[PDB]
Amino acid sequence: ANRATSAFLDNPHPVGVNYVDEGSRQFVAVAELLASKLIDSSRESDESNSDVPFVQAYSKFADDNPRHLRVKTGGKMANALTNVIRSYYSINAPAIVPQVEIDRLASKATVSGDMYNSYAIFNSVPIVEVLSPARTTVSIVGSDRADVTMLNTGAGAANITFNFGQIAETVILKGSVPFQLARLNQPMPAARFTYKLRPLDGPFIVVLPVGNPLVISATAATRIQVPLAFNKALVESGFQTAMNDGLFDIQNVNYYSSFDEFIISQYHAQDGINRVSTCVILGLALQAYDQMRRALPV
Amino acid sequence: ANRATSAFLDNPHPVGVNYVDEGSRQFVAVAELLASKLIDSSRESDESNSDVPFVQAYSKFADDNPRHLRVKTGGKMANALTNVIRSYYSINAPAIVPQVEIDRLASKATVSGDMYNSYAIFNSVPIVEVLSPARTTVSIVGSDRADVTMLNTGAGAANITFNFGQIAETVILKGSVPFQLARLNQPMPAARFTYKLRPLDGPFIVVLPVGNPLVISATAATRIQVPLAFNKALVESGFQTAMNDGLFDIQNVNYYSSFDEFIISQYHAQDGINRVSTCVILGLALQAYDQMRRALPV
Amino acid sequence: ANRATSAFLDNPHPVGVNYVDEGSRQFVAVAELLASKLIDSSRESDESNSDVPFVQAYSKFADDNPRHLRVKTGGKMANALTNVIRSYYSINAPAIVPQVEIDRLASKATVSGDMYNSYAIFNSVPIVEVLSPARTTVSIVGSDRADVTMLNTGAGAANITFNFGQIAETVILKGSVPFQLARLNQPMPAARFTYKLRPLDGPFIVVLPVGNPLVISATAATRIQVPLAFNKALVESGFQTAMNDGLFDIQNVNYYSSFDEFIISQYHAQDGINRVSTCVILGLALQAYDQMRRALPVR
Amino acid sequence: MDVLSKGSLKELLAHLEKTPLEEAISYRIGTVPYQNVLISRNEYYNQLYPDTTSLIDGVSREGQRNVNGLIMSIISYVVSGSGHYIPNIGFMLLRRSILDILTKHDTGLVTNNLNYGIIARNLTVSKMNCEQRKRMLICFKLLAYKDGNQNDYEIYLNQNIPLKQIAPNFIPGDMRTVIHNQDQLAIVGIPLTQSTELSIRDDNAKSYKLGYVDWYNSNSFLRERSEFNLIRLKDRDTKYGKLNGW
Amino acid sequence: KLVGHNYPVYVEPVVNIMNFISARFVADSSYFGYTNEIMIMPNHINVPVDDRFGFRDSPFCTSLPRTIMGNDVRRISYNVFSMMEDIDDVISEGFILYDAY
Amino acid sequence: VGRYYNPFNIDPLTKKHVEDRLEEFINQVQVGRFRNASGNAVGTTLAAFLR
C-alpha cells in the first residue's frame, strides 16, 4: 500500500499564545478600524485637494502630527502591530509589546473584541491520505484545486481510498473521464463525471480501470468563524506583505503560499479549535497591516 | 477517434422558470440593497458603541424588533430569499412563495430591477470536444485554467482538433513548448508559444509531434449582462454558502465548484440563452444571501 | 542538457514611449476618478428612480448633455482614453491624440498624477530556465502556480537546476513527495515538503531520484509600486474587456491571460525598470476603461 | 381578464357559475401546442430568443374533440385567461356554465376516465407559479368529487409532494370550507413598467397585468351597450335538440 | 465650524438615563400605547386570541398569527393600503397592516 | 442640469477659502513693512480689513 498526502497538511507548527485576551483583541480591532479610515482619508484628500482629512486620520493613528522631512512610519501603533503579528505566527517568537501599551492603544476607539460573530468560506482542499494498492501510481498536486493523477498498470481494476478529513464541509470531485465512487460497504453507482460529498461520510473508494490515466479535480469549502470586518482579499494581501517584509522568519516554522493553506492546515492538526482562534486574530491583524503599509510605505 | 470533453460542461440540468418576472426581479434587488445596509449598520453599531443603527436596519429588513431571547433570523424576507434560491436552481424545486408576499417585499425600497444595464467577465474555458486519432492520449483538467495533455505514440505527427464552442469571446492558448496551430483549410505557421483565437473562427487543428508530451494551458473570457449591483466576489462566496446550507440538495441535479462554471455550463446547453437570464438573477440573490447570513448567522 | 522555461516570459514585446509625462499621467488619473463617479451615479440613479445624478456625472465626463436618439459613448474623453491605451501596449501602436486634448481633460479635476504612492503584490511565478541532464524530462505548466513535472529514466540520481530570476521577492516550492533542494555548493538537507527561497540566492539544485515523477508547485510574490487608487480586481476586468473589444490587435505583439503576466514578463526583460513604469500607467487606464464601459454599456 | 383578478375561492367559484362555456373556448385556430420556436425579443437580444409553446400561454391553440380537450380548455382559461380551439362544441354545451361542466351530471359529459397525471403534463404544470397550480387543483378536486374519484385525487397528490403542500383545503360538498378559505389565487391586480419579458408566458401575463387598470374603468359602459337588449346565453331555454359526438 | 469634529465628549449620567428610556420606548411599544401592526378580519373567521383575562371577544392576540386556516395571512403596508382602489375585495378576506405606528 | 461658481471662493467640502495659507498670509502682512522704510500702520490696517 502507498500513502499520498497533501503537501501543506504536513507538520503544522505551533502558533503564538500571547495577545489573545480581551484587551489584546480590542487592540487588533481598533488597529483594523483606524487603518481602514487612513486609506479612505488618503483617497478623500486627493479628490478634495486638501490634506486635512489625511492629517486628522494620521494623527489619530500615530498619536503624532504629520510633519515634512519625516518618514511617516505610523508611530507606536505600527510598531505594536508589527511585533504582535510576529508573536502569533510562532511560539518561539518573543512577545515584546507591554500590556499597558496595548491597552492604551486599544482606548483610541470604542469597538468590541468579538472575533466569532460572522463566518468566512476557505477554499483549501484537505486530502489527509490517499491509499492505493500495488501496481498503481497516485500523485497529488495543488492546494486550491487539487488534481489527483491515477494510473493502473495492474491486470485488473483497483480500489483506491480517499480521506478528506472531518473539518471540511463539502467536497466536489470532477474527473477527466467518468468514473465510479461510493462510500465503504455501499454499491457502486454508474460512471459519472461529478460527485458531491460530505467529508464526514467516511472514506471513499474509487474504482480505477486499467486503460488510461484518470485525473480527479477536487474543490472544497470550509467555514471558519471570523469577525464581521474580515475581508479575505485584504487578508491575502497582508499575508504576502508580512512574508516579504520578513515578519515570519524564525526557526522551525512551516511556510505556506496563502492564508487559506495556513488556517486549514492548523485546523487539521491536534488541538485544532484553539489554533484557529489565534489564526483568525492574525488574519485581522494582517488585514490591518496591509492597509497601513499601503497607505504609508516604508 | 477519441473524444475529450470538459467535465463541467456535461449534462446541464434545467433551471427554474419561476420568480423571473419584473416583480420578482425587484424583490431580489430590494433584498440586496437591504442586506447591504444590514452589514453596514452592524459596523456602525460596533464603532459608535450603540445599538440604534442596527435596530433600525433589522426592523426594516425583518419587520420586527430584535429581541435578546429570540434568535435573529431575518424574518419573512430571509425565508422568501432562501426559497427563491432553491427555485432558481432546479425546475423540480417546490416554488412555494406566494406572489402577494413578493409584491409586499418589493415595495420596501425603490429599485428598477433591471438585470441588463451592465456586464461581467466569466473566466471558465469551454472545451466542447477534442478529437484525437488512434495511438494518441488526450486529457483535460481544470475549469478556470484548462490543461490539455497530449501524447503521441504513432509513427508520424498527428492532427488534433479543438472545438471551443461558439459563445466564448476570446481564448488564449499557451503551451509548454512551442507548437503549431491553424484553422481548418489554412497553412500552419511557425511554432509559437502563444495563440489568441476567436471560438467563432472554427475548429482549430494542432500538430502533435512524436516525442515528449505537449501540454496546452487554456484561458477564456466571456461577457454576460448583469445588473449594476453585481459583485463577483460576493456571488461566489454566496454560492458556496448555499451549497453548504443544502439549498441545492435536489434530485436529478448537477453540481459545480463555482458560480462561474455553473453559468457557463448552462450557456452551452441546447438553447442556452434561455437560462442565462435566470442564472444571473440567482447570482444577485446569492449576493443578498451572503450579506444577510454573514450579518445574521444561523 | 535540455532547457525549459515559462511560456509567458518568452519575447516580451516593447511598450509605448508616449503619454508618459506629468500632464498625461494627470489625465489618466482624472479619467479614473471621473469613471468611478460615473459608476456611483448610475447606482444612485437606480436606487432613486431619477436620472439627474447620472446626467450630471456624464456631463462632467463627456462635457455634453445626454440626448435621446444619440448613443452615450463617453464623448471625447472616451475616445482619447481608448487610443491612449493602445499606445501604451505596443510601440507599433500610433500616437494620434493631440497634446491640447490631454491638457484640456487633465484640468477637469484636481488630482495628483504621481504613480508611486503605494505598492501591490503580483502573483505570477517567473521560471526563467530549468536545465536537466540527458536522461530526464521536465515540463512547466501554469503562470499563477507553476507545476514542474520531472521524470528520471536513467539509473543514477539527477541534478536539476532552477532559475527564478532576480525580480521576485519570495518563491515557495511544495512537492508531491518530499524532495531535496539546496543552493549551489551547499550541502543538501533532509527531504522536506516545502521550501521558502529568495530568488537572489542563486540557482537551486534539486535531486531527482529514479522512479515515480516528482511535481513541484511554485508560488511567487513580487511588489510593484502603483498609485494609491490602483485596484487589482478592476484592472484585470479592464484587461479582459480591452482584449475582447479588439484594441490589443496590433502587429507583432504578445498576448497574455492577465495583467499579472503582462507586467511580470515586461519586468523580466532588458530595461525592465522603464517598461514597468509605462505598464503601471496602462493599468490605471484599464481601471478607468472598465468602470466607464460598465456604466455605459453596449449589447 | 376577469377570471384572473379573483383572489378568493369564493369569487373564483362565483365567476365560474356566472360565466358560460363559450368564453372558456375560443374560435381561433392558433398553432400546434408543443413546439420549439424562435421568437423576437429585440429589447434584450439581437438574435432570436428560443422558447417552447404550450397551453398555458394566453394564446389559442388547437384542441381535440373529447372530454380531455374540453377540460384542458377550461383549466387554461382559469390559469391563463385564454382558452383553446375545440371545433363545433355545440349549443347545448356552450350555454352551460363552467362550474356545471365541472360539478354537475346534467351536462351530458362523462369525466370518470380522466387521468390527472396526464392532464398536468399536457398543461405543463412544471412551468406554473403557485397561484396557477392552486387553481388547477381546484378544478381537479371538483371533477374528482363529481365522479366519485376522490381516491385518485389523493393518489395523484401523493405522487407529487410539492403539489400536496399547496393543495386547497376545501371539500366540494361542504360550504363551510368555501366560506372560511383563506387562499390567495389572484394573478392580475392593480399595483410595473411598460416593458417586455423574455418568456411567452411572462410576456402575455404582463400584458394582462398592464391592461387590468384600463379594463377596470372602460369595461362598464362598453359591456352594457352590447347586451342592452340581449337575452342571456347562460342556461338559455331551448328545445334541447341534441348533443353530438359526446 | 464644528460639524465633522473628532473631539471626544464624555457621556454624562443624564445622557445614559435618556438613552435607556429611548431604547425601551422602541423595544417595548405596548407599554406606551403604540404598535407597529394591526389585523382586520371578518367576524366569521376564527382567530386565536388571548383568553387569560376573560375578555369577551378579546382584541388581543399573543402574537399576530402567521397562518389562518392553513394559509399565511396577507400583509399590506399602510402606504399601499391608502392608495388602494379595490379595498372592498381585499378586506373581504382579511389582512395585516404594518409599516406604520 | 447646470453649474455655477460658489460665491467668495469657498469650498463647501472644506468650508474655508480655497487658499490653505490665508491665515499665515494675513499674519505675514501684519508684521510687514510697506510704503515706508520706517514704521507705519499700513501693514496693521490692511490686516484688520482683510480679517
User: What is the CB neighbour count within 10 angstroms for residue B123?
Assistant: 20
Calculated CA dihedral for residues A245, A246, A248, A249, nearest 10 degrees:
170
114-153 of A, contacting B, C-beta below 8 A = 117-119, 121, 123, 145, 147
Task: Give me the residue label for grid cell 380522466.
Answer: D114
- Give the best residue of D57, D182, D199, D212 to mutate against chain B (max B CB count within 10 A): D199
Long-range contact set of residues B276-279: C-beta below 8 Å, sequence gap at least 24: B276/B224, B276/B225, B277/B20, B277/B115, B277/D44, B277/D198, B278/B15, B278/B16, B278/B17, B278/B20, B278/B88, B279/B15, B279/B88
Residues 6 or more apart whose CB falls under 8 angstroms from that of D75 comprise: D119, D123, D135, D136, D139
* Cβ contact, residue pair E45, D182, below 8 Å: yes
Strands D49-53 and C170-183: unpaired
Does E23 touch chain B if contact means CB atoms closer than 8 Å?
A: yes
Kindly provide the b/e burial profile for residues E9-34, where b requires at least 16 CB atoms within 10 angstroms of the residue's own CB: eeeeeeeeeeeeeeeeeeeeeeeeee
Judge contact between A185 and A167, C-beta under 8 A: no
3-class secondary structure, A196: strand
Amino acid at A142: G
**Centroid of chain to Cα F34:** 16
Judge contact between D178 and D170, C-beta under 8 A: yes
DSSP state of B230: -
CA-to-CA separations, B271 to A41, A74, B171, B275, D9, in angstroms, rounded: 50, 58, 22, 8, 39
Amino acid at D156: Y
* Cβ contact, residue pair B98, E77, below 8 Å: no
Distance from CA of A118 to the nearest CA of B (A): 5
42-61 of A, contacting F, C-beta below 8 A = 48, 50, 52
Residue C218: exposed, middle, or buried by beta-carbon count in 10 A (0-12, 13-18, 19+)? buried
Question: What is the DSSP code string of chain C?
Answer: -EEE--GGGS-PPP---SS-SHHHHHHHHHHHHHHHHHHHHHHHHHHHT-SHHHHHHHHHHHSS---TTS----HHHHHHHHHHHHHHH-TTS-----HHHHHHHHTTS-----S-SEEEEE------EEEE-TTEEEEEE-SSSEEEEEEE-SSS-EEEEEE--SS-SEEEEEEEEEEEEEETTS-----EEEEEE-GGG--EEEEE-SSS-EEEEEEEEEEEEE-TT--HHHHHHHHHHHHHHTTT--TT----SSHHHHHHHHHTSTTHHHHHHHHHHHHHHHHHHHHHHHHS---
- Give the best residue of A193, A232, A236, A287 to mutate against chain B (max B CB count within 10 A): A193
Q: How far apart are CA B93 and CA B111, in angstroms?
A: 27
Q: Can you give the length of chain C in residues?
A: 299
What are the chain E neighbours of D180 within 8 Å (beta carbons)?
A: 44-46, 69
Residue C159: exposed, middle, or buried by beta-carbon count in 10 A (0-12, 13-18, 19+)? middle
Judge contact between C97 and A276, C-beta under 8 A: no
Judge contact between B214 and B139, C-beta under 8 A: no
**Centroid of chain to Cα A51:** 36
Q: How far apart are CA A170 and CA A221, in angstroms?
A: 6
Residue D159: exposed, middle, or buried by beta-carbon count in 10 A (0-12, 13-18, 19+)? exposed
In chain C, the N- to C-terminal Cα span, in Å, equals 53
Q: Helix axis angle, A52-62 relative to A75-89, nearest 10°?
A: 50
Nearest Cα residue to C265 out of A245, B189, B174? B174
3-class secondary structure, B183: strand
Judge contact between A163 and A148, C-beta under 8 A: no
Judge contact between B215 and B175, C-beta under 8 A: yes
Q: How far apart are CA B5 and CA B141, in angstroms?
A: 10
Taking the alpha carbons of A255, A256, A260, A261 in that order, is the dihedral positive or negative?
Answer: negative
Distance from CA of A61 to the nearest CA of F (A): 22
| Cα angle: D117, vertex D121, D123; to 5 degrees | 115
3-class secondary structure, B3: strand
Q: How far apart are CA B113 and CA A92, in angstroms?
A: 56
* Cβ contact, residue pair B114, C255, below 8 Å: no
Q: How far apart are CA D85 and CA D72, in angstroms?
A: 11
Q: Which residue from C minimizes the CA distance to F2? A: C56
45-64 of B, contacting A, C-beta below 8 A = 46-49
Q: How far apart are CA E3 and CA E78, in angstroms?
A: 36
Amino acid at C190: A
Q: How far apart are CA D60 and CA D73, in angstroms?
A: 9
3-class secondary structure, A118: strand
Judge contact between B199 and B165, C-beta under 8 A: yes
What are the chain C neighbours of A139 within 8 Å (beta carbons)?
A: 176, 212-213, 215
Element (H, E) at B147: strand B146-152
| C-alpha cell recorded at residue A49 | 485637494
Taking the alpha carbons of D168, D169, D173, D174 in that order, is the dihedral positive or negative?
Answer: negative
Q: How far apart are CA B157 and CA B211, in angstroms?
A: 10
Q: How far apart are CA D170 and CA A18, in angstroms?
A: 67
Q: How far apart are CA C124 and CA B174, in angstroms?
A: 15
| C-alpha cell recorded at residue D210 | 398592464
Q: How far apart are CA C295 and CA C38, in angstroms?
A: 6
Nearest Cα residue to B1 out of B113, B114, B158? B158
* Cβ contact, residue pair E45, D180, below 8 Å: yes
* Cβ contact, residue pair E73, D182, below 8 Å: yes
Distance from CA of D239 to the nearest CA of B (A): 47
Residues 6 or more apart whose CB falls under 8 angstroms from that of D64 comprise: D86
135-194 of C, contacting F, C-beta below 8 A = none
- Listed by the residue before each break, gaps in chain A with C–N over 2.5 Å are none
CA atoms within 13 A on the CB side of A160: 30
| C-alpha cell recorded at residue A63 | 498619536
Does C191 touch chain A if contact means CB atoms closer than 8 Å?
A: no
Residues of B in CB contact (< 8 Å) with D are 17-18, 20-23, 91, 94-100, 103, 116, 271, 273-274, 277
Q: How far apart are CA A193 and CA B10, in angstroms?
A: 8
Three-class SS of chain D: CCCCCCCCHHHHHHHHHHCEHHHCCCCCCCECCCEEEEECCCCCCCCCEEEEECCCCCCCEECCCCHHHHHHHHHHHHHHCCCCECCCCCHHHHHCEHHHHHHCCCCCCCCCCCCHHHHHHHCCHHHCCHHHHHHHHHHHHHHHHHHCCHHHHHHHHHHCHHHHHCCCCCCCCCCHHHHHCCCCCCCCCCCCCCCCCCCHHHHHHHHHHHHHHHHHHHHHHHHHHHCCCCCCCCCCCCCCCCCCCC
Q: How far apart are CA D188 and CA D213, in angstroms?
A: 10
| Cα angle: A57, vertex A61, A66; to 5 degrees | 65
Question: What is the DSSP code string of A2-49?
Answer: EEE--GGGS-PPP---SS-SHHHHHHHHHHHHHHHHHHHHHHHHHHHT
Does E73 touch chain D if contact means CB atoms closer than 8 Å?
A: yes
| C-alpha cell recorded at residue A292 | 497601513
Q: How far apart are CA A179 and CA A159, in angstroms?
A: 12
Judge contact between A56 and A68, C-beta under 8 A: no
Q: How far apart are CA B118 and CA B228, in angstroms?
A: 5
* Cβ contact, residue pair E44, D179, below 8 Å: yes
Q: How far apart are CA A83 and CA B269, in angstroms?
A: 55
Distance from CA of F24 to the nearest CA of C (A): 23
Q: How far apart are CA C135 and CA C158, in angstroms?
A: 8
User: What is the CB neighbour count within 10 angstroms for residue A81?
Assistant: 23
DSSP state of B63: S
Instruction: Using only the alpha carbons of chain A, give its radius of gyration.
Output: 24
Distance from CA of F25 to the nearest CA of C (A): 23
* Cβ contact, residue pair B243, A221, below 8 Å: yes
Does D47 touch chain B if contact means CB atoms closer than 8 Å?
A: yes
Q: Which residue from C minimizes the CA distance to B225? A: C299
Q: How far apart are CA B54 and CA F4, in angstroms?
A: 39
Q: How far apart are CA F6 and CA F15, in angstroms?
A: 11
Q: Which residue from C minimizes the CA distance to B193? A: C7
Q: How far apart are CA B243 and CA B246, in angstroms?
A: 5
Instruction: Using only the alpha carbons of chain E, give its radius of gyration.
Output: 21
| Cα angle: B78, vertex B79, B84; to 5 degrees | 100
- List the single residue in B18, B21, B103 with the smallest CB-CB distance to D197: B21
Strands (E), chain A: 2-4, 118-122, 129-132, 136-141, 146-152, 158-163, 170-183, 192-197, 204-208, 214-226
